Amino acid sequence: MCMPCFTTDHQMARKCDDCCGGKGRGKCYGPQCLCR
Question: Which of 26, 27, 29, 31 has the highest count of CB atoms within 10 angstroms of its CB?
Fold first, then answer.
């Protein structure tokens, strides 16, 4: 995992995708952010 994600958080997904690379790249699955 690149960074910790939060299903309850809506703005968290933003970072989850960034850590993976850029806006739109990556995905938020569970407590951890999984990059597609």
Answer: 26
The domain in which residue 3 lies consists of 1-36
The total domain count for the chain is: 1
Q: In terms of Cα–Cα distance, which of 33, 31, 36 is closest to 14?
A: 33
Experimental approach: NMR
Q: How far apart are CA 16 and CA 4, in angstroms?
A: 8
CA atoms within 13 A on the CB side of 20: 22
33 within 8 A of 2, measured Cβ to Cβ: yes
